[PDB]
């Protein structure tokens, strides 16, 4: 209610500071980092790259990241704990479920998924005692039956704990609306929900409608663009053609519509990546050398150039994440 | 060559004894036992049940089991080591890949799959130093393109190390033939391959043809029969409608055809199971209270009553697993 759980323990709301609400130390799959660490060079190579990247972000103003890596995205909470300490940046760990649930997970019911999410929030992740401070879910272009089950369990978990829900959206079929519908069917308050990856579209009518219903809007893939890489069908299919300025202009567009309190901005960056083509991390790094420092080094000065008040920018990067992460019913 | 790697270390071929070549301590998914141990009551409860069942198997004559639980089936090699030590039963761990590879696995090349399998065979599983003694692969009714990749990687890993390959088959479209074709195209000897879940069909002609080519035949699901309960469609869809005696007669049939040296017999049992419906483990346990002791307590006596000679039954349970598991790159 006035404290948030991090991988180093509980902190006061005021200690969060500049917060990136959608990031990753490592994007992977369940158990993979432990079974084949040499895929990332080594576990130590990954730690070192991540510590280095978080220090760069820290030097640029970032105090806290929310790692929205879930069980099926290969979340390694011990990795998060080590990297948090070494880089001296707060990290909030996630529960929930992304788009790659294993057979065991796909066989579970809403009540079983709720119990799993609650365990990671209320008791801790694995045998670490480290508690989730956020619930991450995801749907495809069209939501599948199992995805709905995850969203219902997430709502049930949120209603029992006050922990907020962040979503992954994709495609053209306005996924956020499908999700919002399920959430409200479970009686979940929109103010507890961040509809993520919303900068992926230029449909401003879609975002304002969601915001007008009280939903937080996640503009979290700002640096993700092919800044001179069309000779990679893999990149264009997982990055895009809209420049980071185009994505950044949605932030100001929503501000101008009166929704500054509903905006959450992030990089959706990572330091290791195994769930796409080999070495794609190198391609991402070539495009955005700033890493998680992209938002404070590039996006923030840009919005200020376009006339955005310091009061507003401070509110988006500090107040909004604080209000959102603070457990509330 | 003369040594097999177990979760407690290397052992001489001659120490393996009565070996069950297709079993599981726990059937799950990657990372699941560590993330939600309470699904199995507790990790501690799972250990206690596994030790209990392994000791009963040991009492009935079993000295070694091959745990063919892969990465994607949630293999926990530390769990295996712990139950092996407590029960005093050798356990051989697996590498390879079953039917549920994650997105990371599905994105990898044959080269990378091969390297991962080789890592688990040559250096160790995770950070434990425990090396895999078998490669486990699987295909569905109609083999998919990624499954082919996994089989090719397994062939390449086998050729580099001499470690054998065990397969999962399912469906009616003779998957073992699809598998054999891929292995041989990579240059793998059928003598390094056990085509598993072969007792799922009564097609004896399909089996003798495989055995004639030099393949080991895994009759590994003998107690998996839904006979005794018809009010469980989940149990009929995963177990069977044929009797265990029927499955066990396939053993005698293949011996009678002259293929005693190619036969590998097992229960394909487990002590925990999260891959299916909740408490499906309870259903299996009610059908087969003997667990992994089903083969030595029921199937071996049944075969003696069928007039299968003792020396033959011993060759199947002792000599055939030893020859199979012993790392071999002929000549
Ligand atoms: C690239 As993602 C769906 O793990 O934020
Ligand atoms: C039931 As199985 C495919 O894990 O032997
Ligand atoms: Zn996402
Ligand atoms: Zn993400
Ligand atoms: Zn199988
Ligand atoms: Zn099996």
Count H helices, E strands: chain B?
15, 11
What six digits make up the tokens of A142? 């069209």
DSSP letters of A294-329? HIIIIIHHHHHHTT--HHHHHIIIIIHHHHHHS---
User: Under a CB-based contact definition with an 8 Å cutoff, are residues B179 and B156 in contact?
Assistant: no
d(CA B331, CA A117): 55
Report whether A90 belongs to an annotated binding site. Answer: no
Q: What contacts B74, CB < 8 A, 6 or more positions away?
A: A31, A102, A104, B26, B27, B28, B29, B30, B31, B32, B33, B274
B49-67: string of b/e by CB count within 10 Å (b at 16+)?
A: bbbebbbbbbebebbbbbb
B114: nearest Cα among B167, B159, B164 = B159
d(CA B219, CA B326): 20
Phi and psi for A61 in degrees, rounded to 5? 120, -15
d(CA B139, CA B118): 20
Nearest CB to B105; choose among A29, A119, A126? A29
Helix ranges (DSSP H) in A123-203: 145-161, 175-185
d(CA B68, CA B206): 24
Tell whether B111 is within 8 A of chain A (Cβ).
no
Place of tokens 């346990």: B285
B1: nearest Cα among B192, B134, B163 = B163
Shortest CA distance from A98: residue in chain B: B103
Instruction: Tell if the CB–CB gap between A278 and B109 is shorter than 8 Å.
Output: yes
Q: Can you give the length of chain B in residues?
A: 331
A58-77: string of b/e by CB count within 10 Å (b at 16+)?
A: bebebbbbbbbbbbbbbbbb
Given CA atoms B269, B10, B310, B262 in this order, what sign does their dihedral have?
Answer: positive
Q: Give the Cβ contact number of residue B145 at 10 Å.
A: 6
Does the Cβ of B27 fall within 6 Å of ligand 2? Answer: yes
DSSP letters of A53-101? HHHHHHHTT--EEEE---GGGT--HHHHHHHHHHHT-EEE-EEEE-S--
Q: At B222, is the secondary structure helix, strand, or coil?
A: coil
Measured in angstroms, how far is the CA atom of residue B39 from the centroid of ligand 3? 28
Kindly list the distances between the CA atom of residue B231 and the CA atoms of A320, B105, B236, B283, in Å, as whole numbers in the listed order. Answer: 54, 37, 9, 11
What six digits make up the tokens of B331? 């000549």
Q: Can you give the length of chain A in residues?
A: 329
User: Under a CB-based contact definition with an 8 Å cutoff, are residues B282 and B41 in contact?
Assistant: no
Q: At B116, is the secondary structure helix, strand, or coil?
A: helix
CA angle, B101 then A100 then B26, to 5°? 50
Could you tell which of A20, A24, A271, A272 is best to mutate to test the pocket of ligand 1, judged by most ligand atoms within 8 Å of the CB?
A24
What six digits make up the tokens of B90? 């050798």
Does the Cβ of A268 fall within 6 Å of ligand 1? Answer: yes
Phi and psi for A168 in degrees, rounded to 5? -95, 125
State how far Cα A130 lies from the chain centre.
18
Beta pairing class for A3-6 and A9-12: antiparallel
Instruction: Name the β-bridge partners of A91.
Output: A65
Place of tokens 């392994």: B54
User: Under a CB-based contact definition with an 8 Å cutoff, are residues B153 and B110 in contact?
Assistant: yes
Please, is A258 exposed, middle or buried when counting C-beta atoms within 10 Å of its C-beta (0-12, 13-18, 19+)? exposed
B269-281: string of b/e by CB count within 10 Å (b at 16+)?
A: bbbbbbbbbeebb
Instruction: Tell if the CB–CB gap between B32 and A277 is shorter than 8 Å.
Output: no
Measured in angstroms, how far is the CA atom of residue B237 from the centroid of ligand 2? 13
Measured in angstroms, how far is the CA atom of residue B121 from the centroid of ligand 3? 35
DSSP element (H, E) containing A48: helix A43-59
Phi and psi for B19 in degrees, rounded to 5? -120, 130
User: Under a CB-based contact definition with an 8 Å cutoff, are residues B74 and B106 in contact?
Assistant: no
Query: DSSP code of B39?
Result: G
User: Under a CB-based contact definition with an 8 Å cutoff, are residues A288 and A184 in contact?
Assistant: no
DSSP element (H, E) containing A282: helix A280-287
d(CA A111, CA B41): 16
Nearest CA to ligand 1 atom 1: A268
A61: nearest Cα among A325, A294, A309 = A294
User: Under a CB-based contact definition with an 8 Å cutoff, are residues B282 and B265 in contact?
Assistant: no
Nearest CB to B29; choose among A36, A38, A102? A102
State how far Cα A103 lies from the chain centre.
24
State how far Cα A70 lies from the chain centre.
10
State how far Cα A98 lies from the chain centre.
11
Phi and psi for B17 in degrees, rounded to 5? 60, -150
CA dihedral A169, A175, A177, A182 (to 10 degrees): -80
Helix ranges (DSSP H) in chain B: 32-35, 43-59, 77-87, 103-106, 110-122, 145-161, 175-186, 204-213, 233-238, 244-256, 280-287, 294, 300-305, 310-314, 320-325
Q: What is the CATH number for A80?
A: 3.20.20.140
Note which residues in 16-55 of chain B have CB less than 8 A from chain A.
28-32, 34-36, 38-39
Nearest-CA distance B77 → chain A (Å): 11
Instruction: Tell if the CB–CB gap between B29 and A104 is shorter than 8 Å.
Output: yes
User: Under a CB-based contact definition with an 8 Å cutoff, are residues B236 and B227 in contact?
Assistant: no
What domain count does chain B have?
A: 1
Resolution (A): 1.9
d(CA B238, CA A140): 30
State how far Cα A9 lies from the chain centre.
20
d(CA A310, CA B323): 75
Shortest CA distance from B29: residue in chain A: A104
Q: Give the Cβ contact number of residue B297 at 10 Å.
A: 16
d(CA A27, CA A50): 12
DSSP element (H, E) containing A252: helix A244-256
Report whether A22 belongs to an annotated binding site. Answer: yes
Tell whether B119 is within 8 A of chain A (Cβ).
yes
d(CA A157, CA A120): 10
User: Under a CB-based contact definition with an 8 Å cutoff, are residues B70 and B95 in contact?
Assistant: yes
A267-294: string of b/e by CB count within 10 Å (b at 16+)?
A: bbbbbbbbbbbeebbebbbebbebbbbb
B105: nearest Cα among A86, A302, A276, A225 = A276
User: Under a CB-based contact definition with an 8 Å cutoff, are residues A326 and A1 in contact?
Assistant: yes
Instruction: Tell if the CB–CB gap between A102 and B100 is shorter than 8 Å.
Output: yes
Please, is A311 exposed, middle or buried when counting C-beta atoms within 10 Å of its C-beta (0-12, 13-18, 19+)? exposed
DSSP letters of A20-47? EEEE-SEE--TTHHHH-GGGGS-HHHHH
Ligand nearest to C-alpha B94? 6
Could you tell which of A28, A268, A288 is best to mutate to test the pocket of ligand 1, judged by most ligand atoms within 8 Å of the CB?
A268
Query: Longest C-alpha distance within chain A, in Å?
Result: 51
Please, is B219 exposed, middle or buried when counting C-beta atoms within 10 Å of its C-beta (0-12, 13-18, 19+)? buried
Instruction: Tell if the CB–CB gap between A107 and B275 is shorter than 8 Å.
Output: yes
Residues in chain A closer than 8 A to B276 (CB atoms):
107
Residues in chain A closer than 8 A to B28 (CB atoms):
104
- Domain of B313? 1-331
CA angle, A26 then A27 then A32, to 5°? 90
DSSP letters of B169-197? --SSS-HHHHHHHHHHHHT--GGGEEE-S
Nearest CA to ligand 1 atom 4: A27
Residue to test with chain A: of B37, B43, B75, B104, most A Cβ within 10 A? B104
What six digits make up the tokens of A160? 């029992």
Q: At B263, is the secondary structure helix, strand, or coil?
A: strand
DSSP element (H, E) containing A205: helix A204-212
d(CA A38, CA A24): 19
Note which residues in 69-108 of chain B have CB less than 8 A from chain A.
71-72, 74, 99-100, 102-105, 107-108
What six digits make up the tokens of B177? 């033939």
Measured in angstroms, how far is the CA atom of residue B73 from the centroid of ligand 4? 26
B284: nearest Cα among B269, B264, B301 = B269
DSSP element (H, E) containing A11: strand A9-12
User: Under a CB-based contact definition with an 8 Å cutoff, are residues B192 and B167 in contact?
Assistant: no
B206: nearest Cα among B172, B237, B243, B248 = B172
Instruction: Tell if the CB–CB gap between B102 and A100 is shorter than 8 Å.
Output: yes
């Amino acid at each position: 209610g006035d404290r948030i759980n991090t991988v180093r323990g509980p902190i006061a709301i005021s200690e969060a500071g500049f917060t990136l609400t959608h990031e990753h130390i490592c994007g992977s799959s369940a158990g993979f980092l432990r079974a084949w660490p040499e895929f990332f060079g080594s576990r130590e190579a990954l730690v070192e790259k991540a510590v280095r990247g978080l220090r760069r972000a820290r030097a640029a103003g970032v105090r806290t990241i929310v790692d929205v890596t879930t069980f099926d995205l290969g979340r390694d909470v011990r990795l998060l704990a080590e990297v948090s300490r070494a880089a001296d940046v707060h990290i909030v760990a996630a529960t929930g479920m992304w788009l790659d649930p294993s057979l065991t997970i796909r066989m579970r019911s809403v009540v079983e998924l709720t119990q799993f999410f609650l365990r990671e929030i209320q008791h801790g992740i694995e045998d670490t005692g480290i508690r989730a401070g956020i619930i991450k879910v995801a749907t495809t272009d069209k939501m599948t039956p199992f995805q709905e089950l995850v969203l219902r369990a997430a709502a049930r978990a949120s209603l029992a704990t006050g922990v907020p829900v962040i979503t992954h959206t994709e495609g053209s079929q306005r996924g956020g609306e499908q999700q919002a519908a399920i959430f409200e069917s479970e009686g979940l308050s929109p103010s507890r929900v961040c509809i993520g990856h919303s900068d992926e579209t230029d449909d401003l009518s879609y975002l304002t409608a969601l915001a007008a219903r009280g939903y937080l809007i996640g503009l979290d893939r700002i640096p993700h663009n092919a800044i001179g890489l069309e000779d990679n069908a893999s990149a264009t299919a997982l990055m895009g053609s809209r420049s980071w300025q185009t994505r950044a202009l949605l932030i100001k567009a929503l501000i101008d519509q009166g929704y500054k309190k509903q905006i959450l901005v992030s990089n959706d960056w990572l330091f290791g990546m195994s769930c796409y083509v080999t070495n794609f991390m190198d391609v991402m790094d070539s495009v955005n050398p700033d890493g998680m420092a992209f938002i404070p080094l590039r996006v923030i000065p840009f919005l200020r150039e376009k006339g955005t008040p310091q009061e507003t920018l401070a509110g988006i990067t500090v107040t909004n994440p604080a209000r959102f992460l603070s457990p509330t019913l």
